[PDB]
Write an enzyme that holds these catalytic residues in place. Structure first.
Site, PDB file in Angstrom:
ATOM      1  N   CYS A 238       0.783  -1.216   0.000  1.00  0.00           N
ATOM      2  CA  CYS A 238       0.000   0.000   0.000  1.00  0.00           C
ATOM      3  C   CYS A 238       0.831   1.291   0.000  1.00  0.00           C
ATOM      4  CB  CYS A 238      -0.947   0.003   1.202  1.00  0.00           C
ATOM      5  SG  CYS A 238      -1.961   1.500   1.168  1.00  0.00           S
TER       6      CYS A 238
ATOM      7  N   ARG B  41      -0.003   4.384   2.878  1.00  0.00           N
ATOM      8  CA  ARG B  41       0.115   4.234   4.314  1.00  0.00           C
ATOM      9  C   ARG B  41       0.335   5.510   5.137  1.00  0.00           C
ATOM     10  NH1 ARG B  41       4.097  -0.710   4.351  1.00  0.00           N
ATOM     11  NH2 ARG B  41       4.539   0.206   2.302  1.00  0.00           N
TER      12      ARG B  41
ATOM     13  N   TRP C  17      -9.338   5.763  -0.804  1.00  0.00           N
ATOM     14  CA  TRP C  17      -9.652   6.537  -1.989  1.00  0.00           C
ATOM     15  C   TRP C  17      -8.561   6.147  -2.990  1.00  0.00           C
ATOM     16  CZ3 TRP C  17      -8.386   9.636   2.501  1.00  0.00           C
ATOM     17  CH2 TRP C  17      -7.055  10.100   2.498  1.00  0.00           C
TER      18      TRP C  17
ATOM     19  N   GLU D 109      -4.565   3.711 -10.766  1.00  0.00           N
ATOM     20  CA  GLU D 109      -5.254   2.450 -10.581  1.00  0.00           C
ATOM     21  C   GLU D 109      -6.336   2.334 -11.638  1.00  0.00           C
ATOM     22  OE1 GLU D 109      -5.559   3.271  -6.353  1.00  0.00           O
ATOM     23  OE2 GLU D 109      -5.745   1.073  -6.018  1.00  0.00           O
TER      24      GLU D 109
HETATM   25  C1  HEM Z   1      -6.307   6.234   1.795  1.00  0.00           C
HETATM   26  C2  HEM Z   1      -5.953   6.014   0.500  1.00  0.00           C
HETATM   27  C3  HEM Z   1      -5.326   4.870   0.004  1.00  0.00           C
HETATM   28  C4  HEM Z   1      -4.637   4.813  -1.162  1.00  0.00           C
HETATM   29  C5  HEM Z   1      -4.579   5.839  -2.282  1.00  0.00           C
HETATM   30  C6  HEM Z   1      -4.112   3.482  -1.272  1.00  0.00           C
HETATM   31  C7  HEM Z   1      -3.479   3.061  -2.427  1.00  0.00           C
HETATM   32  C8  HEM Z   1      -3.162   1.750  -2.677  1.00  0.00           C
HETATM   33  C9  HEM Z   1      -2.584   1.331  -3.930  1.00  0.00           C
HETATM   34  C10 HEM Z   1      -2.141   2.234  -5.108  1.00  0.00           C
HETATM   35  C11 HEM Z   1      -2.413  -0.033  -3.750  1.00  0.00           C
HETATM   36  C12 HEM Z   1      -1.824  -1.001  -4.775  1.00  0.00           C
HETATM   37  C13 HEM Z   1      -3.068  -1.332  -5.564  1.00  0.00           C
HETATM   38  C14 HEM Z   1      -2.788  -2.187  -6.764  1.00  0.00           C
HETATM   39  O1  HEM Z   1      -1.934  -1.779  -7.578  1.00  0.00           O
HETATM   40  O2  HEM Z   1      -3.429  -3.254  -6.897  1.00  0.00           O
HETATM   41  C15 HEM Z   1      -2.847  -0.433  -2.426  1.00  0.00           C
HETATM   42  C16 HEM Z   1      -2.741  -1.738  -1.899  1.00  0.00           C
HETATM   43  C17 HEM Z   1      -3.162  -2.083  -0.635  1.00  0.00           C
HETATM   44  N1  HEM Z   1      -3.742  -1.193   0.270  1.00  0.00           N
HETATM   45 FE1  HEM Z   1      -3.966   0.788   0.089  1.00  0.00          FE
HETATM   46  N2  HEM Z   1      -4.524   2.674  -0.242  1.00  0.00           N
HETATM   47  C18 HEM Z   1      -5.307   3.502   0.533  1.00  0.00           C
HETATM   48  C19 HEM Z   1      -6.077   3.056   1.641  1.00  0.00           C
HETATM   49  C20 HEM Z   1      -6.025   1.773   2.159  1.00  0.00           C
HETATM   50  C21 HEM Z   1      -6.716   1.355   3.352  1.00  0.00           C
HETATM   51  C22 HEM Z   1      -7.752   2.149   4.115  1.00  0.00           C
HETATM   52  C23 HEM Z   1      -6.299   0.063   3.606  1.00  0.00           C
HETATM   53  C24 HEM Z   1      -6.531  -0.766   4.725  1.00  0.00           C
HETATM   54  C25 HEM Z   1      -7.194  -0.464   5.881  1.00  0.00           C
HETATM   55  C26 HEM Z   1      -5.433  -0.308   2.515  1.00  0.00           C
HETATM   56  C27 HEM Z   1      -4.864  -1.559   2.376  1.00  0.00           C
HETATM   57  C28 HEM Z   1      -4.104  -1.969   1.299  1.00  0.00           C
HETATM   58  C29 HEM Z   1      -3.689  -3.337   1.099  1.00  0.00           C
HETATM   59  C30 HEM Z   1      -3.727  -4.499   2.096  1.00  0.00           C
HETATM   60  C31 HEM Z   1      -3.106  -3.411  -0.099  1.00  0.00           C
HETATM   61  C32 HEM Z   1      -2.512  -4.723  -0.644  1.00  0.00           C
HETATM   62  C33 HEM Z   1      -3.556  -5.679  -1.204  1.00  0.00           C
HETATM   63  C34 HEM Z   1      -3.875  -5.407  -2.653  1.00  0.00           C
HETATM   64  O3  HEM Z   1      -3.000  -5.668  -3.514  1.00  0.00           O
HETATM   65  O4  HEM Z   1      -4.996  -4.928  -2.929  1.00  0.00           O
HETATM   66  N3  HEM Z   1      -5.240   0.748   1.626  1.00  0.00           N
HETATM   67  N4  HEM Z   1      -3.311   0.679  -1.753  1.00  0.00           N
HETATM   68  C1  JI7 Z   2      -8.400   0.089   0.182  1.00  0.00           C
HETATM   69  C2  JI7 Z   2      -7.742   0.322  -1.153  1.00  0.00           C
HETATM   70  C3  JI7 Z   2      -7.549   1.628  -1.666  1.00  0.00           C
HETATM   71  C4  JI7 Z   2      -6.917   1.798  -2.943  1.00  0.00           C
HETATM   72  N1  JI7 Z   2      -6.742   3.068  -3.411  1.00  0.00           N
HETATM   73  N2  JI7 Z   2      -6.508   0.733  -3.664  1.00  0.00           N
HETATM   74  C5  JI7 Z   2      -6.687  -0.537  -3.189  1.00  0.00           C
HETATM   75  C6  JI7 Z   2      -6.193  -1.620  -4.106  1.00  0.00           C
HETATM   76  C7  JI7 Z   2      -7.246  -2.190  -5.039  1.00  0.00           C
HETATM   77  C8  JI7 Z   2      -7.911  -1.165  -6.016  1.00  0.00           C
HETATM   78  N3  JI7 Z   2      -7.171  -1.306  -7.275  1.00  0.00           N
HETATM   79  C9  JI7 Z   2      -7.001  -2.745  -7.391  1.00  0.00           C
HETATM   80  C10 JI7 Z   2      -6.644  -3.261  -5.955  1.00  0.00           C
HETATM   81  N4  JI7 Z   2      -7.249  -4.570  -5.619  1.00  0.00           N
HETATM   82  C11 JI7 Z   2      -6.335  -5.731  -5.573  1.00  0.00           C
HETATM   83  C12 JI7 Z   2      -5.282  -5.765  -6.737  1.00  0.00           C
HETATM   84  N5  JI7 Z   2      -5.168  -7.098  -7.376  1.00  0.00           N
HETATM   85  C13 JI7 Z   2      -5.274  -8.210  -6.457  1.00  0.00           C
HETATM   86  C14 JI7 Z   2      -5.165  -9.555  -7.130  1.00  0.00           C
HETATM   87  C15 JI7 Z   2      -4.158 -10.468  -6.747  1.00  0.00           C
HETATM   88  C16 JI7 Z   2      -4.044 -11.739  -7.343  1.00  0.00           C
HETATM   89  C17 JI7 Z   2      -4.959 -12.129  -8.354  1.00  0.00           C
HETATM   90  C18 JI7 Z   2      -5.979 -11.244  -8.772  1.00  0.00           C
HETATM   91 CL1  JI7 Z   2      -7.081 -11.746 -10.001  1.00  0.00          CL
HETATM   92  C19 JI7 Z   2      -6.100  -9.951  -8.170  1.00  0.00           C
HETATM   93  C20 JI7 Z   2      -7.298  -0.781  -1.937  1.00  0.00           C
END
Ligand code: HEM
Ligand code: JI7
Ligand code: HEM
Ligand code: JI7
Ligand code: H4B
Ligand code: H4B
Ligand code: CAC
Ligand code: CAC
Ligand code: ZN
EC number: 1.14.13.39
Lengths: 405, 405
Positions: free
Chosen positions: A109, A112, A281, A286
């Protein structure tokens, strides 16, 4: 010098040592023989106890009472409870501390910097799939907050030994339908073909657009999944338009404002919350780069390139780079205009450098996944690109989990 | 055991079984991944002897004569020599095979589809800086070939137990000087500040340009290095202009045509060549994105931005992304105009995808460092971004080595 990973920033020439990595009690995919850092994917009362003790110490440390009476008692209070039921429960503020820790510990993330601002909704009293629906409607409402987005997570009951998990089937609270066509192509979002078909097999009456919001497949313990349709008034969306290319609006592209992951397991002190959707947000890339340009997603690069009258015949025209920039600019511009919280990859990586510096002082490092931290466009133009990173697993944490079906 | 590698754009899967041949360790451990780190934190006859057998075994299998007579006889030779002298020597053909394998195994190189086409100059009969200099000049004339670049390597005398190493002090055979101005700023290439000074401290008459080709400091064993100046006519250079922005050329930007690394060590069968400069041709991003746009390099983003009249007031305007794309365009255009070999990041990663495929069928895998294979701009717009990779160390290999001062 120091016997901890040495991290360097090749832009500023600065050095730091990660001493926080020593707190990691879970192994990752690598070994001295080979690095698997680019791969997307990877109870015994005995072991549950230690995880719980570790968490409790972490909690009491966060409130500055390590070794205290409340601390040693709570430890005994958990050993007792595990000792007679196999599990234990967390106190309210313990849940709020762990949820925030899990976010802060997420190596992927980039957002953070906001980790301390998480509205935690305790929904551990939830006992029906219908109630899950209510909690979520509330979540979506509070987090969407009419475009001025607020981070939040709703925590449903934890897994019980010998009992069905509370589960949300959709990967996100809001996701567009993916309709497998006759001719083999997909209408909508190819990422959601399987979830869409699962909705239909369960009674959803499918639409046929490129942007149909999917219904939710919610599931209470040991029951099959009930199907709920979100009220359109709830799912805020942003129609996309370009600040100068007048025809972009004509493409009829759009995206929803709230990014809410919903299929991840929230692990705190050994406990497992299988249904604990969290949202924040978006960072503009993304939507603009992955969702709208990935070859396996909406794939609008060629369309937009044609519109811009670019030479999509040869690679050296950089027609992909040119269009991608405009699509992203459009996501940014449209969201801003609609007054919906968003952050570009520059601002976002800059604030993450700040987060890195804060965490260095507070914990001695920050677990970070470089490949996931660097944006999908303009990589070396952001400061994180030049920042070496140590990746490791700390707990509390968010973990991927097998789909329920 | 064997890692599963997946491509997320096509859903294809492979099993890397080549990593099992990795005899040397990486920076990672199960506890923490250090894969984003740029650098890593007489030899016993027994160890050298096995590295030699292995290499000789590799060489004979390569030409399909494993087990044969020549093979068994060669193994004896190497053993006889090690036993008696604690080292041995390579045969020219073996040397050409080793060098080509070293390139083949370079995890960070995206130009490997070309691994088989490498001109190898055996310069092991070198006994002086002056001789090294003649060799280096011939390499440049050959590799440059009037803009139709050809991949080449020149190998100087291997290192020897107690005796200084032959070394080329410069990191590349062609670098622009970086002169520290009074105000802490830097005229020219900031990355070449230390080396530009070492030449001055060794009698070079500095210049006052932004693109002053540095002279080479060549060092023969146990002797102060010597200063040689490359004949201006040997060093082909490209003036950068934009395909539609006429004002671009007014920036007076230019870059050399030959990318030739000279400070890395080449290791074959346990032998170490401390001076083995190698070259190929550029990939547009190296010049346009990293060289000209890195914060700590020529850092021309602002200038180009203002020259394009962009709102550099806020990041959300994506002025940086917009400028970066035009600069990369000037490089590709300019080089194609000067008829000097160059390859853009889309064509390049496409061919690397093909290479992973040829390598999969040929060796069971291919070591790749994802962070380095994915270009510095438009990362996900290239096939490599969506490709998982396993990174490890094979030999023959190119390694980094201490600066000789
Ligand atoms: C507040 C604004 C936030 C922004 C802009 C942000 C942005 C992002 C981005 C750019 C990613 C990588 C997404 C991807 O490329 O798939 C990500 C992954 C992640 N974020 Fe954040 N995030 C935010 C809030 C949160 C919150 C509130 C949580 C948890 C309470 C969170 C938990 C995670 C987790 C666990 C991942 C890794 C899992 C995944 O790949 O989806 N994020 N976040
Ligand atoms: C809270 C939060 C905020 C924020 N801004 N962005 C995210 C991340 C999610 C919004 N964009 C895509 C991502 N979701 C998970 C990314 N891919 C996961 C995955 C892993 C293995 C296989 C598959 Cl098919 C998919 C979470
Ligand atoms: C012919 C086309 C070639 C191209 C386009 C190419 C491209 C590249 C690129 C983009 C990198 C990443 C470097 C960076 O940006 O920091 C790289 C690394 C590397 N390449 Fe190649 N390469 C080519 C030929 C060669 C040849 C001929 C050899 C050796 C015989 C070679 C050896 C290596 C090595 C050792 C590295 C990693 C070390 C380093 O530079 O940090 N390459 N190459
Ligand atoms: C044959 C070849 C062809 C080609 N097209 N590109 C390269 C890559 C080299 C030329 N452009 C950058 C890279 N040089 C090495 C990258 N960094 C080295 C380094 C290591 C430690 C510390 C520092 Cl500061 C720098 C090699
Ligand atoms: C194969 C590769 O690991 C995969 O495509 C990763 C790369 N980096 C990423 N980074 C982010 N933020 N999100 C992603 O989905 C990915 N995909
Ligand atoms: C620290 C970080 O890994 C470092 O900046 C890497 C990232 N990716 C790279 N990729 C290429 N091609 N070349 C580089 O020099 C780098 N630098
Ligand atoms: C929409 As077309 C230009
Ligand atoms: C070159 As100025 C605009
Ligand atoms: Zn690793």
């Amino acid at each position: 010098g120091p016997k901890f990973p040495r991290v360097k920033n090749w832009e500023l020439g600065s050095i730091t040592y990660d001493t926080l990595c020593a707190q990691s009690q879970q192994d990752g995919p690598c070994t001295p023989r080979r690095c698997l850092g680019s791969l997307v994917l990877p109870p015994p009362a005995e072991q549950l106890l230690s995880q719980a003790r570790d968490f409790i110490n972490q909690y009491y440390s966060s409130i500055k009472r390590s070794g205290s009476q409340a601390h040693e008692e709570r430890l005994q209070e958990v050993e007792a409870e595990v000792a007679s039921t196999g599990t234990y429960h967390l106190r309210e503020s313990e849940l709020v501390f762990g949820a925030k820790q899990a976010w802060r510990n997420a190596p992927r993330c980039v957002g953070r910097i906001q980790w301390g601002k998480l509205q935690v909704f305790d929904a551990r009293d939830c006992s029906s799939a219908q109630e899950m629906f209510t909690y979520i409607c509330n979540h979506i409402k509070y987090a969407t907050n009419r475009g001025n987005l607020r981070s939040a997570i709703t925590v449903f009951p934890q897994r019980a030994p010998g009992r069905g998990d509370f589960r949300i089937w959709n990967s996100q609270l809001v996701r567009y339908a993916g309709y497998r066509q006759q001719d083999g192509s997909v209408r909508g979002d190819p990422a959601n073909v399987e979830i869409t078909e699962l909705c239909i097999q369960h009674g959803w009456t499918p639409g046929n657009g490129r942007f149909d919001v999917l219904p939710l497949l919610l599931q209470a313990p040991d029951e099959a999944p009930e199907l709920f349709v979100l009220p359109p008034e709830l799912v805020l969306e942003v129609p996309l338009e370009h600040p100068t290319l007048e025809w972009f609006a004509a493409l009829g592209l759009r995206w929803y404002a709230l990014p809410a992951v919903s299929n991840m397991l929230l692990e705190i002190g050994g406990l497992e919350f299988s249904a604990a959707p969290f949202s924040g947000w978006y960072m503009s890339t993304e939507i603009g780069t992955r969702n709208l340009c990935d070859p396996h997603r909406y794939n609008i690069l060629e369309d937009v390139a044609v519109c811009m009258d670019l030479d999509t015949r040869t690679t050296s025209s950089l027609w992909k780079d040119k269009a991608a920039v405009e699509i992203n600019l459009a996501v940014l511009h449209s969201f801003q205009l609609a007054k919906v919280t968003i952050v570009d990859h520059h601002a976002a990586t800059v604030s993450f450098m700040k987060h890195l510096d804060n965490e260095q002082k507070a914990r001695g490092g920050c677990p970070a996944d470089w490949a996931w931290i660097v944006p999908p466009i303009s990589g070396s133009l952001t400061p994180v690109f030049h920042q070496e990173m140590v990746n490791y697993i700390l707990s509390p944490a968010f973990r991927y989990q097998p789909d329920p079906w």
